[PDB]
């Protein structure tokens, strides 16, 4: 079939204003992308609904307390001079802007990793020890009260985006990676990986019950190519970004296809970490060069011609103090769409 083409922006670590996201959506539409992936929960949680109240664990937390707790969590992660969080009015505006330009929005609200702000929020809300021991970024899957609170928050974003979006990305990457890269391996040996399987399946059910398709990054799903801790819901679309490395033993793409998962090719050959121009990881020059080397359908370490549903080109703000660099973002988007034009139909 025709394939989707997605531009992904990391607006969780770094605050983006509403008109900046509109300009990105306009560029994506101009260039023939079908979707924009708007990362909003990723270390920071930079979108707050008008009603964040939750009833969980037999307790009620009103909107005032939850919203204020999240705002403090954002400032604890990175008190961005440009802003803290987008509002619901702003997001309604952005979603209408995308709809008028034939662009679907894929939200990302990350858990159980990449949730510094929500962890601090839970601590302010009197939930004891929400973080996994040693981490400031990952929730403890052994802490049922913290996990259930997290699920209740995610559910609120699922409900909101269900009127607008087709896919909801719950993230699921890089467990406890502020400590080291061994988080998934340690969850497996400790036994808690069974509870990660259940958590992912619980979020998948929440998403499906709201009428959307769930998506996650690949690295923690069937880590070590091991299904003996439990099976994952095959309706979880796998955003496949890494084939792993030494001590980071992730399932190959074909493993997921054999189990019936769809693959969204998120090849990290296309990644750009903003501010890494000619030094560091995921450099600008390399991203551009790799857009004329990789096929649109080339998934890291995949057997040739595994089916995919589309591809995702990502810009990250690993260090959110780096400036906006829309000039480079737009060159990356221009180069991606020009090299992959036959898959990205425009007038």
């Amino acid at each position: 079939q025709p394939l989707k083409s997605v531009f992904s922006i990391d607006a969780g670590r770094k605050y983006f204003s509403v008109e900046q996201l509109e300009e990105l959506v306009a560029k994506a539409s101009q260039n023939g992308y079908t979707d924009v992936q708007l990362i909003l929960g990723n270390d920071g949680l930079r979108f707050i609904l008008d009603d964040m109240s939750v009833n969980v664990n037999g307790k009620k937390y009103n909107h005032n307390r939850v919203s204020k707790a999240i705002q403090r969590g954002n400032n604890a992660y990175y008190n961005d001079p440009n802003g803290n969080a987008l509002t619901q009015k702003e997001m309604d505006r952005l979603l209408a802007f995308a709809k008028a330009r034939n662009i679907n929005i894929i939200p990302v609200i990350n858990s159980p990793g990449h949730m510094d702000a929500l962890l601090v929020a839970m601590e302010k809300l009197a939930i004891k020890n929400p973080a996994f021991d040693g981490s400031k970024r990952t929730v403890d899957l052994g802490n049922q009260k913290a996990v259930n609170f997290t699920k209740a928050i995610i559910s609120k974003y699922v409900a909101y985006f269900s009127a607008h979006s087709e896919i909801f990305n719950f993230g699921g990457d890089e467990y406890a990676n502020d400590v080291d890269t061994g988080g998934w391996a340690k969850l497996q040996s400790s036994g808690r990986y069974k509870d990660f399987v259940a958590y992912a399946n619980d979020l998948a059910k929440i998403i499906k019950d709201a009428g959307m398709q769930p998506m996650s990054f690949n690295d923690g799903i069937y880590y070590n190519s091991d299904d003996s801790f439990g099976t994952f819901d095959p309706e979880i679309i796998i955003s496949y970004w890494t084939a792993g490395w030494s001590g980071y033993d992730v399932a190959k793409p074909e493993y997921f296809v054999q189990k019936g998962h769809k693959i969204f090719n998120t090849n990290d050959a296309w990644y750009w970490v903003a501010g890494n121009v000619d030094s560091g990881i995921y450099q600008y020059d390399d991203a551009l060069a790799n857009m004329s080397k990789k096929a649109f359908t080339d998934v890291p370490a995949g057997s040739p011609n595994l089916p995919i549903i589309g591809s995702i080109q990502c810009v990250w703000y690993d260090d959110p103090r780096r400036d906006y660099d829309f000039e480079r973002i737009y060159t990356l988007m221009d180069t991606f769409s020009e090299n992959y034009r036959e898959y990205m139909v425009v007038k």
Binding site: P2, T297, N305, E342, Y343
Partner: peptide, 5 residues
């Protein structure tokens, strides 16, 4: 154009 991969 586009093929059938």
């Amino acid at each position: 154009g586009a093929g059938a991969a």
